[PDB]
Amino acid sequence: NAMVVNNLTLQIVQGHIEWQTADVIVNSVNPHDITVGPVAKSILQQAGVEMKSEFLATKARSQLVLVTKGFNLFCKYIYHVLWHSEFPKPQILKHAMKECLEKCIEQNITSISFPALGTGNMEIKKETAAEILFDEVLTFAKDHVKHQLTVKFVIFPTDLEIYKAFSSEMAKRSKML
Ligand SMILES: NC(=O)c1ccc[n+]([C@@H]2O[C@H](COP(=O)([O-])OP(=O)(O)OC[C@H]3O[C@@H](n4cnc5c(N)ncnc54)[C@H](O)[C@@H]3O)[C@@H](O)[C@H]2O)c1
Predict the structure, then answer these.
(1) For atom 31 of ligand 1, which residue has the closest CA?
(2) Which letter does DSSP use for residue 67 in this model?
(3) Can you count the helices (H) and strands (E) in the chain?
(4) Are 66 and 155 in contact (CB under 8 A)?
(5) Per-domain residue ranges for the chain?
(6) Residues lining ligand 1, CB < 6 A?
(7) How is this chain modified after translation?
């Protein structure tokens, strides 16, 4: 459950997203309230109260990914994916991914770790999230091969099913290429 495409390393990992080390860790929030949701909470606790200040002070809107520093996370930046409510969810994911990965070229990011975005509450189906997540990652690997990137998909330990889907999607993908 890891593979290298050109200058891109991609790994599936069972752990907590807020306990990661990477240039960038991806948050997943409702923009009206970043104190709600599994990932948003984990991150808010770990990163500390000062993370919610820079976040409320920099929303001021079509911004799909808000960027902050990492505070007490072992990261340089946090990319907060903002799920706005007036959009198709599979499209928000697909667009939030590309932006997050484009920002990786913008900020000379070498490593980025993402949770299983959009699987919360069964909003996007597990295989579809995985389909989309790999889709965009692989796209980037082909379209910007000059940029070295380590991408982790962090799956929560108890979420065995989500894990089984990402393995399978990765398997499927490597069978090509
Ligand atoms: N308004 C909506 O219709 C809508 C749609 C999508 C997302 N959202 C917002 O985003 C969140 C839900 O979407 P999501 O799926 O990106 O987020 P989430 O916070 O529910 O987590 C999504 C997935 O990541 C897993 N996960 C990975 N690492 C984890 C960790 N360290 N702790 C806990 N869970 C972890 C979760 O169990 C789940 O499978 C909520 O905050 C919600 O407001 C809202």
Answers:
(1) 16
(2) E
(3) 5, 7
(4) no
(5) 2-175
(6) 16-18, 28-30, 36-40, 42, 83, 85, 89, 115-120, 123, 154, 156, 159, 162
(7) ADP-ribosylated by PARP14.
How many angstroms from the chain centroid is the CA of residue 114?
3
C-alpha distances out from residue 41 to 1, 5, 105, 173, Å = 27, 33, 28, 32
Which atom from ligand 1 is nearest to the alpha carbon of 17?
A: 31
Query: What would be the CATH architecture of the domain defined by 2-175?
Result: 3-Layer(aba) Sandwich (3.40)
| CA proximity to 60, closest of 76, 82, 44, 39 | 82
Distance CA 139, CA 132 (A): 10
How far is residue 138's CA from residue 46's CA, in Å, rounded to a whole number? 30
